[PDB]
Amino acid sequence: TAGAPAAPKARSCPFLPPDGIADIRAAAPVTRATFTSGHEAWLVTGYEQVRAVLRDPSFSVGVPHALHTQDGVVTQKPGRGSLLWQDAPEHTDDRKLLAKEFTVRRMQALRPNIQRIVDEHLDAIEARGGPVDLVKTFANPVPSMVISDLFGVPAERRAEFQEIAEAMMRVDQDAAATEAAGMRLGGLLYQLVQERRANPGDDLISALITTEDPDGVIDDMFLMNAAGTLLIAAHDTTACMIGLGTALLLDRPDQLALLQKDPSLIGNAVEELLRYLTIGQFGAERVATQDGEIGGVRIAKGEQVVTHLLSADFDPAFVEDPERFDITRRPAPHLAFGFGAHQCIGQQLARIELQIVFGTLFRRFPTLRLAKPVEELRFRNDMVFYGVHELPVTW
Numbered sequence: 001t002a003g004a005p006a007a008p009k010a011r012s013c014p015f016l017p018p019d020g021i022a023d024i025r026a027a028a029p030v031t032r033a034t035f036t037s038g039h040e041a042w043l044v045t046g047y048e049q050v051r052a053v054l055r056d057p058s059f060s061v062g063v064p065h066a067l068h069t070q071d072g073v074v075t076q077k078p079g080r081g082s083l084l085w086q087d088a089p090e091h092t093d094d095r096k097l098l099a100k101e102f103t104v105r106r107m108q109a110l111r112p113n114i115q116r117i118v119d120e121h122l123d124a125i126e127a128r129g130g131p132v133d134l135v136k137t138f139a140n141p142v143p144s145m146v147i148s149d150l151f152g153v154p155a156e157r158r159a160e161f162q163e164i165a166e167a168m169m170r171v172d173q174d175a176a177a178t179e180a181a182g183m184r185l186g187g188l189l190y191q192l193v194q195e196r197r198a199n200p201g202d203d204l205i206s207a208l209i210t211t212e213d214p215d216g217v218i219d220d221m222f223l224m225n226a227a228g229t230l231l232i233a234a235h236d237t238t239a240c241m242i243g244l245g246t247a248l249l250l251d252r253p254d255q256l257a258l259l260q261k262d263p264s265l266i267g268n269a270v271e272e273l274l275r276y277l278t279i280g281q282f283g284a285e286r287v288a289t290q291d292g293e294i295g296g297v298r299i300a301k302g303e304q305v306v307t308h309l310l311s312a313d314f315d316p317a318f319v320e321d322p323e324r325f326d327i328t329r330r331p332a333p334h335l336a337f338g339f340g341a342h343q344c345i346g347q348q349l350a351r352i353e354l355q356i357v358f359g360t361l362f363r364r365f366p367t368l369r370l371a372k373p374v375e376e377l378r379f380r381n382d383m384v385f386y387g388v389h390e391l392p393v394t395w
Ligand code: HEM
Pocket: 083, 084, 085, 095, 229, 230, 231, 233, 234, 235, 237, 238, 241, 274, 279, 280, 284, 285, 335, 336, 337, 338, 339, 341, 342, 343, 344, 345, 346, 347, 349, 350
């Protein structure tokens, strides 16, 4: 046909973006391409233009196609309180309500909880010795357990929360509301909400229950949608970064050795891991709602746009020598958490989880190493979030 060329996806090097991106970004940071669905849309690859799209409040997240799926069909989505598919003014109002209780202060307060969760999972790995799959024993279970503490889940209920979260982790966030595992999570959340109403606590769900609700928006469905969305948005993504960050650090002993010599670099290292790895691999989707202009290219009403966060995090106009992994950079504002109104709401919590996971993993296991070469690893090449399927490690 006369379709624009396929958006680059192949990687000859598994810790770098797809090979084709650089040449496009440099010549044409706003261009057309054809995505997995067969549809064509704008492909924005340069840092500055990705930020211009994402900060413009007239783009909508209600898109006509699902470009990264085979059939392109946009499935049915959850309602108010789920955020990801809402637009203003409802998105603005619902996010501000959730953010009233889901505060950066509540996220910092979870530090000790996180440290305990991280330490228990490593004592079990330790008690039974190498080799082990880090993905299954550590990267998958830790982030949902963090969230279960966020939600006040008591210890007798954890095994069931973890099993259900794990089934959901295998499903894409876009498909949750129309999959079976979604129903099983719905039933758990309905029940969790009733328990908290009956027995309030210090946790997030208890606080939302009694938050100041002038417009009368908070009912059980809103709460289930918010909790559900927090869990699903936090679990797969943070698990992928744990597994993929671990693999990259294990494959860069020079950067690892810097961190072991000066552990106060943990902050900076986490920022460079996020930039370098930008796990949302295929690009975020928006649709224009009015005519506009990005990078001197006219964008029309109804046109879909894909902001390629990975490509933009490797743009040489953003940082010097982008293909170099260097944990001593001064953090610059990467796009691994997005930008603008829909930017990751859990950014601060995810940073804490990763700082604690990598601080502690390398402090307790300085001899950690791969039990198989990086070319035998199997990467998540076709998944929404990039990472490793398995990460066998020893010490
Ligand atoms: C505690 C963990 C996390 C929680 C609770 C969380 C929560 C969320 C939620 C609710 C949203 C939707 C926000 C909205 O539309 O208003 C979101 C967006 C996003 N999150 Fe997270 N997140 C977590 C961790 C992560 C991690 C580890 C990453 C990436 C490495 C990530 C990347 C994103 C990105 C890119 C977006 C924006 C998508 C877009 O605008 O199209 N998040 N996050």
